[PDB]
Design a binder for these strands. Sequence first.
RNA 1: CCCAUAGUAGGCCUAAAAGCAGCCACCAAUUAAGAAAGCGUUCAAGCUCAACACCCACUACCUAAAAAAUCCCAAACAUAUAA
RNA 2: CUCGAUGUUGGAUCAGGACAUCCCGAUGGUGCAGCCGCUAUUAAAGGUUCGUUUGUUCAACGAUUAAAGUCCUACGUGAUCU
Lengths: 51, 222, 43, 122, 39, 38, 38
Amino acid sequence: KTSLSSPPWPEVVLPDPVEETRHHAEVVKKVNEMIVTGQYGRLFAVVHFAS
Amino acid sequence: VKTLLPVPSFEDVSIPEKPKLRFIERAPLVPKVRREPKNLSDIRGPSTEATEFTEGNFAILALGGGYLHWGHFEMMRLTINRSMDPKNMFAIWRVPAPFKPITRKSVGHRMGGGKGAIDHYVTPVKAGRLVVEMGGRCEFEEVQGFLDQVAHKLPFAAKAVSRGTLEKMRKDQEERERNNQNPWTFERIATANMLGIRKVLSPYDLTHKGKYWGKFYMPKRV
Amino acid sequence: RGRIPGRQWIGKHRRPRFVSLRAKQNMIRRLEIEAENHYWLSM
Amino acid sequence: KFTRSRIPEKVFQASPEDHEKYGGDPQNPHKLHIVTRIKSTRRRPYWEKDIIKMLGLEKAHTPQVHKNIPSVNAKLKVVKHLIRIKPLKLPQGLPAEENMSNTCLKSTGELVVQWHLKPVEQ
Amino acid sequence: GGSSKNLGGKSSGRRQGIKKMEGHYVHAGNIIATQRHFR
Amino acid sequence: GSKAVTRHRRVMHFQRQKLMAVTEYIPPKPAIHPSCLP
Amino acid sequence: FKNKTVLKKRCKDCYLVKRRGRWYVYCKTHPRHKQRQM
RNA sequence: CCCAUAGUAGGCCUAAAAGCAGCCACCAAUUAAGAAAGCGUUCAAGCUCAACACCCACUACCUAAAAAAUCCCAAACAUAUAA
RNA sequence: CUCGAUGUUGGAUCAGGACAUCCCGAUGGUGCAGCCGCUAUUAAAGGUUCGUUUGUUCAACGAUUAAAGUCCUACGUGAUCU
Ligand SMILES: [K+]
Ligand SMILES: [K+]
Ligand SMILES: [K+]
Ligand SMILES: [K+]
Ligand SMILES: [K+]
Ligand SMILES: [Mg+2]
Ligand SMILES: [Mg+2]
Ligand SMILES: [Mg+2]
Ligand SMILES: [Mg+2]
Ligand SMILES: [Mg+2]
Ligand SMILES: [Mg+2]
Ligand SMILES: [Mg+2]
Ligand SMILES: [Mg+2]
Ligand SMILES: [Mg+2]
Ligand SMILES: [Mg+2]
Ligand SMILES: [Mg+2]
Ligand SMILES: [Mg+2]
Ligand SMILES: [Mg+2]
Ligand SMILES: [Mg+2]
Ligand SMILES: [Mg+2]
Ligand SMILES: [Mg+2]
Ligand SMILES: [Zn+2]
């Protein structure tokens, strides 16, 4: 171990794709249920119009 | 038991009758009347004459172009004739005597009024030419001392060489060109006129290949 | 102090211009395009 | 003096290594070039200016199609430093009368004959 | 001051040379080339 | 202007300066320094 | 001390030393040999 | 770094020439040391180098600076993954 | 650059600046005994004269001084003068 033995940034371990695919489905279902049940107030949107 | 080694024998070498360097005259035998242009391309680019050894084994290599006047020849002659052993050494001239006339106008005169009068003569020299060649019953370390001293006083970049060092110098340059890891070279770009680069180059750059700039030679350029 | 004689970018004595890293990369980028142009003009 | 530049023919002889790098087939040469001007004619000799006009490359970054033939290539070589040359690729063949109006030239050089503007169901 | 000792030498070009190159069509009488010596 | 051959090293056109910079000899670098191997 | 662009030892007793950021030639036997890097 | 005896001051020249003003030779004693490579002495002495011994100095053998006149002149920074 | 004008020598007045230092300071070398010198490094805080002939800057000469430095500043400076 030295000041230059390893990079300065911390090591990042990304989630398992199989496990994350299941977590993603849960998040999407939760947000979809909020839409069905109307758990939102004022909305905003970014629209492309006239270039 | 310090291991001794054989020594080269120079018994087979012959010494001329006038080993010392002959005298060079300021101007040629018959004075010239026709005035000449500068013709500065006589010191520009690689040399195509007096690039190889003829009789001796050691010489002074020119690493740049320039003009030699009488003052230079006297410095070379006296310095060499004094430092050399006439019995075991000999020297010869590899450059002709000053022949190119150099005109010059009188002090205080304005531009115009024709051309100046012949003042002195010079010998044009190109890069890669041998100026003085030595040889005889001597090693390189012996002549290299006073030969480098002379090379430093010349108007161009010079250096003492030998049949071996000169050969190695040339083979080392070829090795650099072969193992060069840069995929872009001056030759490839210039000859193909890539990027329209020939708009800032010279027609001579097709043959010099970036190793020459005016009278200066760059050995580190591949 | 540090004057350049006459005008900066002309004449005998000039302000020295140096080649930056990105100036080099710019040239190499266009050398690669032209090298490929050579290839497609060969057939 | 500055003059027109004669390019040695060796410059336009591709080596086996080049074919690997760029992926062309010497035995099946591409028929049509895609040519785009990526350099200005300002500060270039007039003869180069003249050829850029002849090839329809006055507007930069505008692809033009030209025949891959010696005469055209001769012009392209004079201005090779001002343009980018790529082969026109026809993955679904030449456009027909039915699909003339549904073509798009992609950045890869492939001229596709169907342009749905839809995501790929695959 | 001083003066140059070279006088003359101000002749204009003769405009000599080939007028009809290889393959050109000529009518009878047309000059094909002009020359100072037999080239 | 100055002549093609000068006593001083003439300044180069910037495009030529860049040309020289881009075409400098690059020596072959070994993966492992040879002094670090038997 | 004489300023010199090229420092040269003039006798066996001369010894090169770098002090205050520049090279010096010192000689105890012949103090006249003392040289300073210029 | 260490260390140095000897045919012999070799012959000739020279007032003198003793390794070292010049000319010729450049052989040999001692395990080892050039009829001497650089200083030195009027000539000699005297101090080194090439020798032996000791012993892994186990070298690099590519290079050289600076000053003007109103007042230096952006501020700064060697570390977070091209764009 | 300036001729619908950027006033041309030397002096007077007041000087700003550079150091390649004439004097004063601190140092190395010397064919430096000492006293005097010669030479180089460092130092620009302070100082660096008055007269005879000459329009002169210079030059020569007289008497001094620790020393009578070299230069730049539109050959500093005439809306300050001569
Ligand atoms: K020289
Ligand atoms: K200039
Ligand atoms: K003797
Ligand atoms: K005027
Ligand atoms: K008077
Ligand atoms: Mg200016
Ligand atoms: Mg004529
Ligand atoms: Mg005419
Ligand atoms: Mg010219
Ligand atoms: Mg003896
Ligand atoms: Mg005797
Ligand atoms: Mg003798
Ligand atoms: Mg003697
Ligand atoms: Mg013996
Ligand atoms: Mg020894
Ligand atoms: Mg006015
Ligand atoms: Mg003052
Ligand atoms: Mg000073
Ligand atoms: Mg004035
Ligand atoms: Mg008035
Ligand atoms: Mg005024
Ligand atoms: Zn000494």
